[PDB]
Amino acid sequence: MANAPHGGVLKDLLARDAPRQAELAAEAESLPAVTLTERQLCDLELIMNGGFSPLEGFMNQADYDRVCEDNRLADGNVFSMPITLDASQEVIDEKKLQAASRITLRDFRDDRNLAILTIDDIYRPDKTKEAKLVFGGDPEHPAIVYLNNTVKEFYIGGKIEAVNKLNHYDYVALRYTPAELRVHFDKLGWSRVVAFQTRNPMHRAHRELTVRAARSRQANVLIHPVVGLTKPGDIDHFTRVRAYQALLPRYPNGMAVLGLLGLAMRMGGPREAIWHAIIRKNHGATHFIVGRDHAGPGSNSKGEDFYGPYDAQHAVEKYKDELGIEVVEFQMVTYLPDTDEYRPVDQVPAGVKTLNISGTELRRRLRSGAHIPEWFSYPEVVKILRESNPPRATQGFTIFLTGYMNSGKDAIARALQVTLNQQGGRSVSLLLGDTVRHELSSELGFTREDRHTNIQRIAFVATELTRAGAAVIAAPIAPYEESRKFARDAVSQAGSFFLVHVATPLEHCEQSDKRGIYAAARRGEIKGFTGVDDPYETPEKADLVVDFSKQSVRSIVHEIILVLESQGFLERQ
Amino acid sequence: MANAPHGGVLKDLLARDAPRQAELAAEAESLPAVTLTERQLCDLELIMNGGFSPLEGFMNQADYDRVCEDNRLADGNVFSMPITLDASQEVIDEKKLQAASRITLRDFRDDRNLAILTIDDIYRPDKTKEAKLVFGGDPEHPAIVYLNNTVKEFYIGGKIEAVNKLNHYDYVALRYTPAELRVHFDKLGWSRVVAFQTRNPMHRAHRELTVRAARSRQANVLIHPVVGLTKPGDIDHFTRVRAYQALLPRYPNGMAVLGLLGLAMRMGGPREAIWHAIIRKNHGATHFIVGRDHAGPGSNSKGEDFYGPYDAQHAVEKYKDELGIEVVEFQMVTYLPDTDEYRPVDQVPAGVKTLNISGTELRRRLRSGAHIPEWFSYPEVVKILRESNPPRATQGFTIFLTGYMNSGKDAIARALQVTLNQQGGRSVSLLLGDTVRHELSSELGFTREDRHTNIQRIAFVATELTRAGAAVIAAPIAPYEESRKFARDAVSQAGSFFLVHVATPLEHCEQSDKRGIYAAARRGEIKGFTGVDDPYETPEKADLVVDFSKQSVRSIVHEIILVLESQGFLERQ
Amino acid sequence: RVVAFQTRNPMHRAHRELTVRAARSRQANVLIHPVVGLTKPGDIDHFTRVRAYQALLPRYPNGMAVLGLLGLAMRMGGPREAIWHAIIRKNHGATHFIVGRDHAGPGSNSKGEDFYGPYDAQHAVEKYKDELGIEVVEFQMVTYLPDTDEYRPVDQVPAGVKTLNISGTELRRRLRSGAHIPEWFSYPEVV
């Protein structure tokens, strides 16, 4: 086999309870139901699949206490991370929860019944104690700011009975239970396996690092990246995974397996590192790389590191032998251009080439689109990591016109459309004031509130189109700063926004009115008409100001085109 | 200059009335304005800029009749096609229109004042005589059916005065007036110039007709394709011009010029031809190519060809000498594979290679994406002509789910999103029932009418996104066939639509309801709730039927993915 | 729904277009299930064959197929083997099974007699099909249309397109000689 489960027996509860599936499923229907948070879900998944072996439920007091203070569960097995389910008095009463109560753990994403937990105790934990003992104490620590702003007042210990495994629709082939991974290592004659934990990109150095370990420890590699619960439309998450997959064939043929790991990290440094060692051991890895600042939060508001570069490694080594897993401490190497190789911080003769790119500099570049050294990260991988920060020539954008009724914005807008359909870089969506009123706001009025709603409605549609990479041209009146500000923020989430104030003077608008709407509004036939009986909050930081009285349309369209051209949006075909 | 104008003087009314622009301008601010149609604006453009010399206003009765019988204008000059403005008695009176009346001719696209027509008469045309001798007759003919259905009872003759150029925002570099083209031919020393008339794609044999025709008449080439007024989002149009532009570099360097002619064709065969010949002569061409069925409407109901394959070429030679311009009747050649050349319907030895693709076959192919012979049409040109019939792997599409409240469609929808965001071919827009209700229909109700409006609202947004190439997933209840049919038609205009009926049985939906909405609706706390007090018109031709009681979501999402995959939409990366 | 394909041969473009069409029409995925007997440690021919199959795998729509080896000792018992085959794939979880002309066929005796007719396999698996609980997918192998750059049934071809179809005896012949092979016939990396 690979490495034995932590505690000697894999707590594969889904396998254990499979035979009763349908009955637990039936009863899971009636029981009082607690709907889990994202953290309790990620935990439940590893509890159920034996990832937290020997653990087999959410921690009760005898486990939790000896874990918070001794890094051990009651039975004596090493375990450095509190795994608990929390509730408030309201719900504990509200649902009659108490020792012996059987409850249903529900998935907040799709409402599935995942498990049935038979209660042990319902204690009120000392969070001040937990934060200091488990995460260091700093009020700024992520897991602490969480333990005090989300975790409820009480913990509910209790063994778990698995009914259904969580449903994930992204990358099922890359999701491996500890059993699947163990079977896999076994089919291929695998014995020693070095697991690599990460929550980041993965470049050349990472590739050279894992390979060297594998080769020196005469072993195979498990690339085990961490993911939390997937956000249906979180493209960043898909980009990340594709990055990893892209990197897979740069590894010696047959040496590695890529596997996603559903873990809700605390960023509890040393303590998480030990936890991690356990989880990989359960997953069948025999070796675990531990890095500098492993699972590290970084530094507080006033530059204090929450942990030192080496505490992780010092922790996992202290327990290493007991746990039965080998640690592989990495001494990351650099690049030697003249050489075309990589070597330890020492295997480099004085004066070779200190070629090493910065992470802050890499992000910086990925953002700017500034070429990245192929010696630093493979092409196909970088090609994918960039997609989450696309080139302006690809981004959709919204041109949001605003100004009095009949200020010429409609004509300007139509001409901008023909102009942009000629440059042909994207599809163009036109949302004229009236079209919007007819299609999406036919039953709204003109009160401050109603107009605001109408604009939020244009922003929403514009924001979806901007996200699809379209060029959206909107020409509502948008009399209020509050509205326009809203539209700008809504759309910015998906691409760029430009406010063009068609500042044509009112008098000009009225005089040229050939529909008598200003006339009717003047004589009360229309209530609170903008400019007449309702205000027009003149824009203050418009991206472009124009006057249909002073400039022709092609000239105006062209000023708009110039702004877009100057920001890289139009890099033509 | 090239060939002298028609009649002898270029009717550059715009140039003329230019020193009086502002004056005639302000005078049009008050005169009784009339908005012209597209056929009228296109006739107005060539009148105000001389394209129609000697003609200089819409033909009053004198001009109009001698043309219908003698093919001549009043003053004796040849002119085979009527240029008349029209109106109905309601408007003749409404504004008080009689000879000596000064009307303002308005542009519908932007309400710009273009010309001031000072009447000469207001007669009522024998739309029967005209349509018979002028357009050949047959009750089918496109111009006839326009004449009878669209042309008003009476025509308004009167010379014209130019007040504004007429704003086009596309391809200004390709838009030439007869003056502009004359100046260009003059700067280049161009004497003899051969013009080409087309309303079609222009492939390779064309580049062979033109070059061969010009090199033998020792001349240069004016590629003069036609265009009516531009519908701001008539992508096909930009595609066409782009095709023409890509073809330009396939010409012996400097041999040809590309010019767009804003002419409204009447598809009036032999007579339109002769009209064309004058238009080009006014534009400075010394020669004109006249083809088989030039300006032909093809066939009629029973299959009768309105004109003979040579009624056009032979019609122009009758007046050829008088007009001044010379005719270059083309004898289109074929392709010789073995040879790698093209030659007349006779210059081909018995048994070479009758390689000639069909037009009906080419459209057919362009549609299907079936490769097209480079000997037939250049690559870069065909690459563009296809963009108006994109590959399914590029088209956006809408997956429109429908079924009872809580039928599982929401969960299906979310998983379809994750699934589609993993395949990453397009951006994905999720329009869940509630999101839609909150963002676009927050103030609609649930009456037959209201729900219908809500769906039309989803269709609109979905149709814009489908057009931008997005994957749209909508999960409203959509209880009515009328609604769903509407959405299907709205979206089909921009891409594909799939109706997925989440046919989960009501009982199942109620039993599983964990929000008590079915409960409340049962006891009257909610009026006309679908399934309870309001009907659910079960779909009949759903693209896919699913049951959330019988199938898991991944299995359901996968059936949906299979349909998409099978229709070429997912051709992955 | 999963359509299994049984073979003991190479696998080219036509085979690729065939399996795909079935999958698409029956709204299903594909199981490429080639047959292998016990491996001869140094039988390079066997490694070549499998690599051929693997090479062909990415020419299949992303996500549509799975390649799986099947340890079967065939008898070349035509009709009867075909039924047997249907059973084995059904056990393997396939819901559909393609049955070809001369499925698991020995060919013809010393004096030109076919041991079975082109269609007996299909007639056998259909006779039992419903009882067994597996759907048969009879293939109507298509040809190639050069002018078109497509493939179509022995009928979907207008009179005079291009009867472009390479022979198996001619393919072996070529593979041997090293004489170029039409990319429209078999993918490059596979050949």
Ligand SMILES: Nc1ncnc2c1ncn2[C@@H]1O[C@H](COP(=O)(O)OS(=O)(=O)O)[C@@H](OP(=O)(O)O)[C@H]1O
């Ligand atoms: N009280 C009042 N105030 C302002 N505008 C009014 C009002 N009542 C009607 N209209 C007519 O509706 C169009 C203005 O719509 P908008 O969508 O621009 O309004 S807003 O931006 O939400 O404030 C525009 O008409 P269209 O030309 O049909 O768009 C206005 O003339």
Ligand SMILES: Nc1ncnc2c1ncn2[C@@H]1O[C@H](COP(=O)(O)OS(=O)(=O)O)[C@@H](OP(=O)(O)O)[C@H]1O
């Ligand atoms: N009379 C009536 N009929 C149907 N549904 C009703 C009704 N009244 C309210 N609701 C709640 O609104 C959601 C259903 O809205 P839909 O937009 O899907 O319905 S429709 O397609 O417009 O007919 C859905 O709620 P959410 O799922 O919370 O959005 C319904 O429970």
